[PDB]
Amino acid sequence: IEQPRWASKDSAAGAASTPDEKIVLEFMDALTSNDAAKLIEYFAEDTMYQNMPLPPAYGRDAVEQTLAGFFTVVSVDAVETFHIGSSNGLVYTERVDVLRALPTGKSYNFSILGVFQLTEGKITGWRDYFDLREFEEAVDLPLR
Amino acid sequence: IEQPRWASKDSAAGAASTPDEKIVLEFMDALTSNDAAKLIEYFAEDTMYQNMPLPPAYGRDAVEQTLAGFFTVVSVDAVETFHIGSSNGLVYTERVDVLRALPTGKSYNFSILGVFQLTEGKITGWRDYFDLREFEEAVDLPLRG
């Protein structure tokens, strides 16, 4: 994965400088685990996860079921975070995720800007904004 | 457009508190002008605009031609900015843009998280992340990606 022309050292992942930013990076590295059970430990009970604008999951159970489901048809092979930053209690990640569909073995590069809200070090909110034109094809589940 | 459940007042548009953040909100407001010539004045010579992951525009001329072309086929009917914030020289807008296709009159609500890099108050980079599944339909031009 190439680092973009527009990448800024000033906001590089290696320069994360808050407890919140550090946890989110750690959550990013954990994604390649494809382990809903390891990942849900990062979330608060009162929480949410959405791939905009698909139906969101509210509550830690729903988030766990949504993740478990994705990891059933899809592997997260790599996460490259170009930018991490934060403002007003929100953390932002500009990044690329490499996704591989399990039934097909086809790989995909999704350019993603995500926002995270954390309360007492745990995720109360997670929204990834990206193009879902291929996400349709990549995730062998109805986008519903 | 209603405020989503996840909207936080701490990061609301009304609470913008840096000159960069305020310039970006001004720029969001101006989008409904549908005027490439007025919008282009917000940009530095060395700039870029991209709707990920479509081919990017680099330089002021390309950005203006791009905007002008969009406004030939789409009106930006409304922009609601739920969140604005900034960090390490970047400004982020969490928002919805209402777009209307001119040939059909159909409307579309796009949920967008966008990043802006400003140098001396001018836009040196602008990247919007959102679902393009309907952007294809909405926009009566070939997408190039």
Swiss-Prot record, chain A:
Belongs to the limonene-1,2-epoxide hydrolase family. Pathway: Terpene metabolism; (4R)-limonene degradation; (1S,4R)-1-hydroxylimonen-2-one from (4R)-limonene: step 2/3. Changing residue 49 to F: 15% of wild-type catalytic efficiency. Changing residue 51 to A: Almost no activity. Signal peptide: none annotated. It comes from the Bacteria. Optimum temperature is 50 degrees Celsius. The active site is at 97 (proton donor), 128 (proton acceptor). The keyword Secreted does not apply. It catalyses: limonene 1,2-epoxide + H2O = limonene-1,2-diol. Monomer. This is Limonene-1,2-epoxide hydrolase. GO terms for molecular function: limonene-1,2-epoxide hydrolase activity. Pfam families: LEH (PF07858). It comes from Rhodococcus erythropolis (Arthrobacter picolinophilus). The keyword Hydrolase applies. It is an enzyme of class 3 (hydrolase). Its EC number is 3.3.2.8. The gene is limA. Induction: By growth on monoterpenes. Catalyzes the conversion of limonene-1,2-epoxide to limonene-1,2-diol. Can use both the (-) and (+) isomers of limonene-1,2-epoxide as substrates and also has some activity with 1-methylcyclohexene oxide, cyclohexene oxide and indene oxide as substrates.
